[PDB]
Write a protein of this length. Structure first.
Ligand SMILES: *Cc1c(COP(=O)(O)O)cnc(C)c1O
Ligand SMILES: *Cc1c(COP(=O)(O)O)cnc(C)c1O
Ligand SMILES: NCc1ccc(Cn2cc(Cl)cn2)cc1
Ligand SMILES: NCc1ccc(Cn2cc(Cl)cn2)cc1
Ligand SMILES: NCc1ccc(Cn2cc(Cl)cn2)cc1
Lengths: 429, 429
């Protein structure tokens, strides 16, 4: 298919994320290649090379077409593409499980594989609810979280999305009614944690779990909070016997400067979700980890088996490329790399602070954010970024980047320069 | 890793489908290769080749490692592993969308890709609810189905699984309360349809959609029903203004003897889900199709964009191998192939009818079922089939096969002989 043919088919038949089909002002750009940190896009009939500043929605941490990950996939393809995990096991699942239990916060020793982040959140919730059924306390069936959060798009995941500002706010009337604490602040304030504890204590008898994104809230606004709040949540949850669930689907695998964001606080949750960067951005995969105690209690009393079983659970191809991606991360000085990335983002974004439409500039590990004083118009931002050789995808009032870890300092500065120029145009006519 | 190393890791760390970790009597068997219709499994430390009679949970319709599908994957890998579908489009998504709209029942012209079958069902429900919001009828928010059904394991999907004796039956007190008609019979009885209509009529003002598996109900009990019931559902839904959703995640791509099971009835649903065999069993992918009316009425409306967007939406690798799998199917006389398979299954399973523990033997396309009067003990069934060179995975009281379409008559004879012996052993205790 030619790019024009792709556009024609796409316009007629393809539904894109978070969109109204046939009614979008900005049509999709045809992508025809991806190699390393770079995408080849078609613009005005011509191929152009642009930096994947988004890591393809925060997944491509080693860039595209990395030889180690390419070869892990083709090696597995030669031996066994896929077998059913109902009754069978295999080397890629075993290797990945062993890696994941070893590098995640202490105590997480069991792994349930699934095929997407939203599903892994549903599995986490099912684990928490079934845990309390196993304890003979089925009244513990609600979830508690703080505002500003995002956890996926399936219906129970939607129920812990920010109710007022979140993307799922129109569905409130048909979603499970959960408990929401106020927006967690950036700076540490003991009064916030005291209030959180007071609220949880009032509901502890009907709460299965607290579910949060640790340190960075991504899709709900790229907000950062002090890691000490996580220490407080762990303490509160322990004392009131409410399970703690960390959704690290966006924060995992080095993105915030620690291997997992929980590590900034030294905290272990009872249950943890991972995804996105898990596969290095090659294939959809996710996992839900829990403690031995959670796993065993889930089938205690009359609760029985955990009745979940995705058709492609523990897919050998996805697991094999994840093993390679994780081993590639651990086998280098990733902490120094991310520290260098963060410094590049900070240095490169500093001039944006003085721009008239900019309300905040903030960086956490390999995440760089310009918060603007109005929603960013994609019809303006997209050409401006492409004109400067960078793929950016703003949402709401945020111009942000989550770049591949393999970006050179020059490439990071190219990305930040494009972000600054997009922000300059937001406050231009 | 050696098989014994895999077993040790698996026992310590891996949660398998529908199971109580650490409490399962039958431990998983190590799989070390798959090719064509065959798996290489480890029995007492030794590698044996056995037939994948289950097609790895009904996905591997062309067998494992088919050269055309292998090549399609490796070709795409060299060019572009993945890019985000938020703002970008690409050739594999366009090619697959075009194929799917062309070969599905008439009127389905819009494709929303997702990462798993359960998610595609949640997307279908979301489309249906948002449709009626777009018509100014937000009270139309419940689903109706018949008993015996299965639609996945996420919490909305669970709500249309049969609450009485279905796999999610312990969760009734938590799930959305849907409307259930009685079990649809095998033989056509217009009285059943009239009763379904009268029940639907009473609820029409609060129903968004009827959701069913057409012709074959898979995971809920391998039951078959007359296609004329689907014709009745289409008419009832038309007259009472309720959307019709067909879940073809198990029945799609030739499995029941028609390309899609809806084709047996000659009707089209408003919304359709596909998955499993979509990728030929290589990778997790699913899709939700809808009509132009549904697509355009969503976002009419005041009701805005469809707020769903899986991170790995329309993954180029998964789309590329699916395109190859679908083209491979369409490029052969698949209808004759399935007819031959059905004949082989019928001939091979016939002697099972006389067995004392057997209550029914039934075949529909490339699906063969022996229904027993008692649960099938996996601890007995698994070694018995393996020693006969066949991988079978019974569940509840069912010994069944859904073999790869590439199985030779000899291989089908081998599969059915193993099934018959399992059924024979069931009636020995
Ligand atoms: C397999 C299947 C699904 C989806 O299950 P997943 O585990 O998410 O793949 C949904 N509906 C039907 C009828 C199925 O057979
Ligand atoms: C991306 C993400 C998810 C899952 O979304 P999917 O679209 O299912 O991949 C869940 N939680 C968080 C915090 C995420 O960033
Ligand atoms: N479903 C995964 C996912 C990934 C990235 C984002 C970012 N985002 C995009 C929009 Cl539109 C709003 N937020 C939102 C959701
Ligand atoms: N989630 C997909 C899927 C696929 C096959 C089956 C078959 N099955 C397995 C058991 Cl246990 C009960 N049914 C059940 C679920
Ligand atoms: N025409 C394909 C097809 C469709 C439905 C069934 C199941 N069934 C057949 C009859 Cl007759 C009653 N039920 C068996 C085969």
């Amino acid at each position: 298919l030619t790019p024009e043919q792709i556009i024609a088919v796409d316009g007629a038949h393809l539904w894109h994320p978070y969109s109204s089909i046939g009614r979008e002002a900005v049509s999709p750009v045809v992508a025809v290649a991806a190699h390393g940190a770079w995408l080849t896009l078609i613009r005005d009939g011509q191929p152009i090379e642009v930096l994947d500043a988004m890591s393809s929605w925060w997944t491509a941490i080693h860039g595209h077409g990395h030889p180690a990950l390419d070869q892990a996939l083709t090696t597995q393809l030669r031996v066994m593409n896929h077998v059913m995990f109902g009754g069978l096991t295999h080397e890629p699942a075993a290797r990945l499980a062993k890696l994941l239990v070893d590098i995640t916060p202490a105590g997480l020793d069991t792994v349930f594989f699934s095929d997407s982040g939203s599903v892994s959140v549903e599995v986490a919730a099912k684990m928490a609810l079934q845990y309390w059924r196993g304890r003979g306390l089925p009244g513990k069936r609600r979830l508690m979280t703080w505002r500003g959060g995002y956890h996926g798009d399936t219906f129970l995941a939607m129920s812990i999305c920010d109710p007022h500002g979140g993307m799922h706010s129109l569905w409130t009337d048909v979603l499970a009614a959960q408990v929401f604490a106020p927006q967690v602040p950036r700076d540490y304030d003991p009064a916030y944690s005291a209030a959180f504890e007071a609220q949880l204590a009032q509901h502890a008898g009907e709460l299965a779990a607290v579910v949060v994104e640790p340190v960075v809230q991504g899709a709900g606004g790229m907000r950062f909070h002090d890691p000490r709040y996580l220490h407080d949540l762990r303490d509160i949850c322990r004392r009131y016997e409410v399970l703690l669930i960390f959704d690290e689907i966006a924060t995992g695998f080095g993105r915030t400067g620690a291997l997992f964001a929980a590590d900034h606080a030294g905290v272990s949750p009872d249950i943890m979700c991972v995804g996105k960067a898990l596969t290095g951005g090659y294939l959809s995969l996710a996992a839900t980890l829990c403690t031995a105690d959670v796993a065993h209690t889930i089938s205690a009393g009359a609760a029985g088996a955990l009745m979940h079983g995705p058709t492609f659970m523990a897919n050998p191809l996805a697991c094999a490329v994840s093993v390679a991606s994780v081993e590639l991360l651990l086998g280098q000085d990733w902490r120094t790399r991310i520290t260098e990335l963060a410094a590049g983002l900070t240095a490169g974004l500093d001039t944006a602070r003085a721009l008239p439409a900019v309300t905040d500039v903030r960086v956490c590990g390999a995440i760089g954010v310009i918060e603007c004083d109005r929603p960013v118009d994609l019809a303006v931002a997209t050409p401006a970024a492409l004109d400067r050789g960078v793929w950016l995808r703003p949402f709401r009032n945020l111009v942000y980047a989550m770049p591949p870890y393999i970006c050179t300092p020059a490439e990071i500065t190219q990305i930040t320069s494009a972000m600054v120029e997009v922000a300059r145009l937001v406050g231009s006519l």
